[PDB]
Write a protein that binds this ligand. Structure first.
Ligand code: ACO
Ligand code: ACO
Lengths: 179, 177
């Protein structure tokens, strides 16, 4: 139940249901303390980072995405494994999902260190729109590809989000099992 | 750089290079204060904490265990891939570690496991896990198949694959739960 008030603000996007503002390290102390508390609050589930925030019309902070510079990520790949049975049993074509993290470091630009959305405003495209803004705004004048972003230490929510967001059952990660 | 003092502790094994003791939720207030300070630096109720203390009196390893019902299998594979080098293509295999979505029953969750950096590769983590197997459920000796590891790090992955013997191991608080 945390709120946030302008003192300027810097809007990257406006919508029927709210706004996405960005906050940078150079911003007033008032902004830096709020990202902090929001950080702390999100942790229940610094240097050249950028923080995105989705603010409901209410002024309530309902989205947060913290992003950092990186050089490398590791691909996670959706596989669906065949279940083979004994020759005396009947055959079924149900596959079992598995998620495979490649050990090969592939090139990357933008590491999503944190990405959170308030439990009861989920599946409303908030996280998608935040990344969409991260992409247009991580580098001034560039539109990052889906592959230049990696997600730090995916939770299962993150996995299911990332996969659908990027298409093709793949996404890059870091702070994970291969590095 | 924490030191534990010999008191009358619950000692699970003695070794030439030190000992392993255990701290339970309802222990004396000293014990639980010490475990908490070991918790913090490591990270730079229904649980059990195992400490490896060297003859030097130093806290050299920490193992925090936990009850659980479910784990997910992680296994190394070589995935068919295409290597593309400006127009030119070849077929190859990429090493990857695969986590199955299938829940499997597990009893004991290694929520933390840690050995002080200078003391690694001296079988301290292996031993902590041995003390754990024969001190988790009374009158019972845990199978490797009944142990799972919380959110493994790359170090923990390299340890578990070898410690578990099969090239496979179970996890939780990971990408599938
Ligand atoms: C921190 C990291 O780097 S990764 C971990 C991310 N942080 C967390 O896990 C904290 C708790 N969870 C969350 O905050 C949220 O679940 C997030 C950030 C992962 C997703 O937030 P949302 O705003 O609900 O995602 P969004 O609406 O943009 O998702 C769009 C699509 O992604 C997929 N998706 C997102 N979350 C889920 C889910 N929990 N289960 C299944 N599919 C999902 C769906 O296809 C969804 O489309 P649909 O609703 O039309 O069927
Ligand atoms: C929180 C969790 O649940 S998982 C995360 C585990 N903890 C951490 O990541 C903290 C940092 N790392 C660690 O503290 C340690 O490396 C631990 C706890 C993973 C292992 O501690 P150790 O006492 O060095 O393990 P141990 O000595 O019993 O290793 C036995 C075998 O596992 C394998 N192994 C253990 N560490 C490694 C490694 N870093 N690289 C490659 N193989 C390894 C080796 O085969 C080793 O046998 P060997 O030395 O004869 O070749």
């Amino acid at each position: 139940l945390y709120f946030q008030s302008m003192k300027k603000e810097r809007i990257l996007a406006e919508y029927p249901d709210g706004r996405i503002i960005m906050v940078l390290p150079e911003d007033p102390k008032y902004a830096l303390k709020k990202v902090d508390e929001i950080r702390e609050m999100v942790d229940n589930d610094y240097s050249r980072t950028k923080t995105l925030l989705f603010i409901s019309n209410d002024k309530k902070v309902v989205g947060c995405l913290i992003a950092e510079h990186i050089q490398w990520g590791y691909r996670v790949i959706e596989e669906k494994l065949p279940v083979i049975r004994s020759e005396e049993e009947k055959v079924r074509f149900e596959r079992q999902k598995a998620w495979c993290c490649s050990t090969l470091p592939e090139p990357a630009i933008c590491g999503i260190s944190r990405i959170w959305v308030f439990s009861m405003m989920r599946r409303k495209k908030i996280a998608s729109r935040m990344i969409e803004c991260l992409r247009s705004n991580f580098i001034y004048g560039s539109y990052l590809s889906k592959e230049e972003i990696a997600f730090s230490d995916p939770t299962p929510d993150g996995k299911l989000f990332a996969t659908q967001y990027c298409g093709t059952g793949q996404f890059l990660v870091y702070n994970f099992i291969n590095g």
